[PDB]
Design a protein around this motif. Sequence first.
Motif, PDB file in Angstrom:
ATOM      1  N   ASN G  26      88.932  87.318  52.120  1.00  0.00           N
ATOM      2  CA  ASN G  26      89.372  88.590  52.735  1.00  0.00           C
ATOM      3  C   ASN G  26      90.891  88.680  52.637  1.00  0.00           C
ATOM      4  OD1 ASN G  26      86.632  88.341  53.633  1.00  0.00           O
ATOM      5  ND2 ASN G  26      87.373  87.457  55.553  1.00  0.00           N
ATOM      6  N   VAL G  27      91.599  87.577  52.874  1.00  0.00           N
ATOM      7  CA  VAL G  27      93.091  87.626  52.893  1.00  0.00           C
ATOM      8  C   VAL G  27      93.629  87.256  51.518  1.00  0.00           C
ATOM      9  CG1 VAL G  27      94.795  87.445  54.736  1.00  0.00           C
ATOM     10  CG2 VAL G  27      92.616  86.246  54.946  1.00  0.00           C
ATOM     11  N   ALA G  28      94.572  88.038  51.009  1.00  0.00           N
ATOM     12  CA  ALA G  28      95.113  87.806  49.659  1.00  0.00           C
ATOM     13  C   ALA G  28      96.577  87.398  49.782  1.00  0.00           C
ATOM     14  CB  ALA G  28      94.997  89.092  48.902  1.00  0.00           C
ATOM     15  N   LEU G  29      96.969  86.296  49.151  1.00  0.00           N
ATOM     16  CA  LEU G  29      98.359  85.803  49.284  1.00  0.00           C
ATOM     17  C   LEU G  29      99.203  86.498  48.228  1.00  0.00           C
ATOM     18  CD1 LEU G  29      97.621  82.010  49.823  1.00  0.00           C
ATOM     19  CD2 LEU G  29      97.703  83.870  51.488  1.00  0.00           C
ATOM     20  N   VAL G  30     100.105  87.363  48.660  1.00  0.00           N
ATOM     21  CA  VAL G  30     100.991  88.087  47.719  1.00  0.00           C
ATOM     22  C   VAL G  30     102.387  87.490  47.844  1.00  0.00           C
ATOM     23  CG1 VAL G  30     101.798  90.415  47.116  1.00  0.00           C
ATOM     24  CG2 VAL G  30      99.565  90.123  48.176  1.00  0.00           C
ATOM     25  N   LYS G  31     103.157  87.460  46.759  1.00  0.00           N
ATOM     26  CA  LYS G  31     104.562  87.006  46.832  1.00  0.00           C
ATOM     27  C   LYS G  31     105.383  88.248  46.537  1.00  0.00           C
ATOM     28  CE  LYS G  31     108.117  84.621  46.865  1.00  0.00           C
ATOM     29  NZ  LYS G  31     108.007  85.739  47.831  1.00  0.00           N
TER      30      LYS G  31
END
Lengths: 130, 184, 47, 270, 170, 194, 98
Positions: G26-31
Motif C-alpha cells: 500500500n505504501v510506496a517509497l518515493v525519493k
Amino acid sequence: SYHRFVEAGRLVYLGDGPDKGKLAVIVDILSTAAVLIDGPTTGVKRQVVSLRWAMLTDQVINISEKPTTEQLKKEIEASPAIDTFMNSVWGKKIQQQRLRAKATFEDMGKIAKLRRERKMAMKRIAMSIK
Amino acid sequence: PLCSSMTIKVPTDVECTINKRVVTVKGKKGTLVRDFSHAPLDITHANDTISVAVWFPRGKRNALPRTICSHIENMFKGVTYGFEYKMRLAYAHFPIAATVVDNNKAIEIRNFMHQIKTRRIECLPGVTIAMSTNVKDELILRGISIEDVSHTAARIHESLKVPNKDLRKFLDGCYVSSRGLQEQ
Amino acid sequence: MEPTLINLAREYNQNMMICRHCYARNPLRATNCRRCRGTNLRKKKLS
Amino acid sequence: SHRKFSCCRKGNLGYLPRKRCTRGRGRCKTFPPDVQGAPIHLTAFLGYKAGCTHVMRFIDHRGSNLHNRQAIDQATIIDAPPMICTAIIGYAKTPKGLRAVTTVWAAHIAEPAMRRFYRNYFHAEKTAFSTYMKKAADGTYIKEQLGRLKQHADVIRIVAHTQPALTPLKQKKADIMEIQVNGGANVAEKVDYAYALMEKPISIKDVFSVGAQIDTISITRGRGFEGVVTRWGVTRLPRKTRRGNRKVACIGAWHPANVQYTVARAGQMG
Amino acid sequence: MQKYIVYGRRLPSEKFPEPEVFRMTIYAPNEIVAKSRFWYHLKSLKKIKRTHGEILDCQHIEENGDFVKNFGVLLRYRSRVGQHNMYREVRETTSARAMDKVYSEMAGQCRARYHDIQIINVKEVADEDVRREKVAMFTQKGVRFPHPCPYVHVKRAARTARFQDRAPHV
Amino acid sequence: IVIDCKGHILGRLSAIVAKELLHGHEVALVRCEKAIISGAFRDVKAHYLKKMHKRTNFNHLRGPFHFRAPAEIVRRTIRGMIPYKTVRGSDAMSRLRVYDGIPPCCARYKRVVCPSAMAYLCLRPERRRCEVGRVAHEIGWQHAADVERYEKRRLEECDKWYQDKIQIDKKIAEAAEKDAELQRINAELAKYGY
Amino acid sequence: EEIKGKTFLPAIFVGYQRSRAKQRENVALVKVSGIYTRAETDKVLGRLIAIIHSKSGKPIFGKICRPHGNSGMVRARFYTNLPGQLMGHKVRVFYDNI
RNA sequence: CGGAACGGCGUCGGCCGGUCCCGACA
RNA sequence: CUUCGAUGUCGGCUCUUCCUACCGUCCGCGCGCACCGGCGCGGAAGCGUCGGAUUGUUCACCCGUUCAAGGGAUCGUGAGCU
RNA sequence: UCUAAGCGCGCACCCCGCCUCGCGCCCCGCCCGGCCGCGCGCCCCAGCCCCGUGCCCCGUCGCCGAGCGGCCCCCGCCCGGG
C-alpha cells in the motif's frame, strides 16, 4: 598547512550543528579537536564548537586575550573583517544561500520554470554565436 | 600543536628552488631534482634556510623532518663538492681484473675466482665509474647524487657474490672502502 | 691478499650479529632483531 | 588416502579440449616479433605436405659425438605452389586489442580466390567484388584506401591465395592467408612494400632461407572416436578383468561428486 | 556530565541520635545515577547502605562557561588486569564538560565504562601547573595550527547527491 | 550519468553507482584503471590473486569467472551490490557501461566526479593507496600500455579543443546581455537566490 | 492528458515500504529530488504525485504522506496500489494545485 | 583475524624511581 | 548425534585431484661450515619419491638403482575390477 | 641503523607469453539501406593560487540541420567423394 591558520580571532563559518551558515569568532582554542567560538553580531552564543564544524575564513580579527562577550562584540564592530568577508565570493554565496534556504514548494515551482528558461536562452545564445 | 620543524641552510653558490614538494638544487657540479612528494611536509625556502616541518606529528611522521633535510643536504653537498665511493677489489689466488668501458659508465669484471662467466655492470645515469691511478685494485666512482653513486657501488658489490662455501673464510669481492665525497 | 683488504672484507662478512630465531644479519649494536620481531638473543662467529 | 606410488598425470591438459578443429585450416594465430629493423620480410607461407624422405647430412656440431661425422634424418617435403597477394589488411593497435582499419583488395581477383568465396561456383551467380571492380580498375580508389592504412594502421598484413591447379590435389578453390609484413623502418614504407607485391607471385625462396628454422601449423591426422588407452595413454588393465580392460577404472572419488575435467574420457582423437 | 553535589546521612538511631552528614561531588548523567553512586561510595568509605541511610539533598550545580580552564582528574580505572590509578588533564570550559571529555578518552584509550571509573578528585590547574604535553601545548598564549581536519568539509558531498562537476579542492 | 572513475575508491563509488542503477538511472564509468583501492599494492594483488584461485574443481568453465580487465573488475564489484539474479537486478546491470579509458563513444559526454568516494577525502594520507590499473596488469590484463598510449592522444586532442572552447566561451560572455538579463534579475539574485 | 503543462518536480519510485520479512505494498517509497533531509520533506508532504503507466499510457495519480527516513525519502499512497513493474520509473510531484 | 603460555626499538596512554643549565678527563 | 521396509566391508590394481606439518631439486641465512660432505632455519608444493624377494597385507623387512618426505578425499576409488 | 618515508637486487613458486579452445566482435565482399541519442578541458589536495560552486526540466516543449557517436540489416542445401 600553508595559509589560513587557526589563530585566535579567526572568523569561522559554521558548517554543521545547531548553527550552520552563521559566522563566529574563535575566542580560544581548547584542544586540537575543538575551539571556543563566539559570534555576538551573528547570534552564535559563546559555545564550544568542534574544529570539524568550523570552516576557517581568510579574514582574522584582532581580539583582546580572553576577550569576554561584551569586549568581543565591541572589537567586532571596529574591525571591517565581517564586511570584507560578506563582499567576498564566499560571502556573496553565503548571502545568496540564505534566500535559497527561505523557500516553499510554490516558490520552488517559479524557480524551476526560470531555470528552464535560462537553460533555453543559453542554448539560443550559444547557437547564435556558433 | 607541534610542527616538528628541522632547519637546513642553503649554501651561497648553489641555488635551490622548491615548487610543490619537488626540490631542484643547481650547482657547479650539476643540477639534481629530488621529488619529496612521497610524504606530508611543509617547506619554506626562506631568506637562506630550507625548513621541513610536519604539523600534527604522529609516531612515524616524527622521522620525516630530519631525513628530508638530510637528503636535501646531500643534494647540496653533491652539487658543490660531488660524491665519490672508493671500492677496492680484493683478490686471493686468482687476480680480479675490472676494465672501465662505455666512456666510464660501465665496468666489465672477469677472472673473479677464475670463473668463465664475466659480469657487465652499468653505472646509473649521471654517475660515472673510474679506476684508481695510484693505489690500483680500487674503483673510484663519482657522481652528484649520494644515493645513485651508492646504488651503483651496491650493484657491483653483489655482482661479485661467492656462490656458497664459507664467506668468513673466502673473502673475495668489491667492497666499498671510503665514501670520499671530495671532487666529482 | 693485503691485511687492510682482509679486514675490509671481514667488516662486510664476519663482523655482524645473528639473532637466534631470525638467523638474520642484524647490525652490530642491535638492541632487537628487525626480522625476528625483536627477540633479544644474538651471537656471531669467525674462522 | 594417497596414490601410494607416485605416478604423473597422463596427457597434457593444455591440449584440452580435444575436439575436431572447427577452424578450417591450421591458422597462424600469433605472428613473429616485428623487430622494426630488418629488410622487409613476409613471415609465413601455406604448403601442402607432399611426403617424407631420407637425407644424408654432415654434422659440424662441436662438442657432440656427431662432430665431423655423417647422419641420416627424416625429411618432410612441403609442396609450395607459389602464392599470389590479393589484398593488404592494416590493423590499428587499439586499447581493446589489434583491430582492423579496413582492407584494400586487388583490382583483379583470380578465379581460384573467387572459387573460395562460393560453395558451388557453377551454380553460383559469380557476384563477388562486382561493384568493387568498378570502384577500382582506375586504381585511384585503391591508392586512397592504402593511404588511409598508412596513417591508421600499425601492423600491416598481406592477404594471399594459393593456386591449387599447380598442386596435385583437387581443392580447386584457393586458400586465403593474411601473411604479416615485418621489419620495415616505418608503416608508410611497409604499405609501399606491400603495393609492389600486390597481384604478383610470392615464392617460398623469398619468404624463408635454407638453415633457418620454421614452425609448422596444421590439423593432425584424425583417428575418430578413440579409447582412453589410445587417446590419453592409460594402461590396459589386468586381462582377468570383467567388462573390459580398455577403460580407466575409477573416474573420481566420492567427493567431488562430479567427474573432474582432468579425468581421461573417451572422445575424438585426431 | 551534570555536576551534582549530594548531602546524605545515616538513618537516625538510638546510638547515633544525630548521625554524621557526608557531602560528595558526584559528576553524573542524572540525579538518579548521582544518588546511586553516592550510596556506593558511602557504603565502601563510610559503611552506610541506602537501606540504612537517607540522602537529604542532591542539588544540581550549574557552572559558567565563559573561558577554557585546564582541569585535572585523578581516577582509579579497572581493566581486566585489576584496579590501577590514573591522572588525566583536560582543557575545557566547565568541570562537567571536562569530566565528559575525561570519560570519553578513558572509554577509547583504556576501555573502561562510567561505572568502572571512580573519581578520586577534580580540580582547576593553572597555565603554570600543567603536567601533560597536550594541555601544555594549547595552554601557551599563542597557538596557531593549520585546520586539523580540512577534509571533514565533505559533509556537503553527502547532500550534493555526490555529482559535483569538478572534484572539490580543500 | 558518466562518472570519471579517476581517484574513486572501487567500493565507495560502486555503492553510490549501484543505487543510481537500481533507481532507473543509466550510468557509465570511464577511466576505471585510474580508480583506487585502499591497501598496500602487495596486499591488494594478494587478495586479487587469492580470488583467482577460487575456481570450480570439476570444470573451471562453470567456475567463478574472474575477469582481468580493470573495467570488468569494477563491473563485478558493482554486481556484488546489485541483486543481479532478479529482473530488477539484471535490467540494472544492463544499464551500466564500464570503460577503461574514456572511449570514442563517451568522449563528448559530460562527466561528473562523486566527491564522497574520491580517495584524497576518503582515506588518510599514509594508507599506501593502490590503483586498479597497476593491480590489473599483474593479475593478467594485457592492455595497460595500450590504454596509456591512446589516452595520451585523447588528452592532447582535448587540449587543442580547450583553446577553442575558451575562445568560444569568451565569445558567449560578450553575448550575455539579452532577455537572460531579465531572467537572471528575476531569479539569480532576487528572492530565489539561485 | 489531465497533465498537460504542470511543471512538476522529478521523483523516483524506489520500492514499496518493506522489511526483510514482509512488504506493505500500500505504501510506496518515493525519493523527492532536491529533498535530502527529513526536515525538507514537510514542504513536499501532502502534495499530489502521479506515475505514468508505461504499458497503459494513462497516469496513475496519488498523494505524499509521512516521510520514510532521515534522508528526505517520503512514504506515499496512490489511488490504486502500484504494480511493481513501475519501480525506478519516474513519479511527478505537481507544482500546480491539481 | 576460534585460541594459550610467551614475545615485540609498533603506536598511544598510564603508574612509580634516578640524573636535568651546578649543561645530563675537559 | 545420525543410519538396521540394508549407504556392500579389508588391502591391491586403475585413475584423478588436494594438503604441507619439505626428503631431493630452487632461493637466501646460520654452523662447533678451510675443501668435500654434513647439520639447522626461513620462503617454497612446480618436478621426482622408482624395480624387485617373503606376506592378503596397510605395515614390516631385505635386495638393488638417478639411493627414493609424510598425509586428505564415506579409513578416495565393487552396476570399475579383484 | 635494510625502514619509518624513499631505493636497488631477487625463488624450480606466482602471473602473463607461446600454446588448446573460444562466446562474441571487427574488417571486407554482395549490398551499401533504414533506426536512435544529443552531452567533453586537464591536473592537483602539505598551495588547496583563490576554493566554499554548478547541473538541478528527458518533456516539464527539447525534438531543424550539421557534427560526433551508437544500433539494425544481410550471407542455403540435398547429392557425390575424401
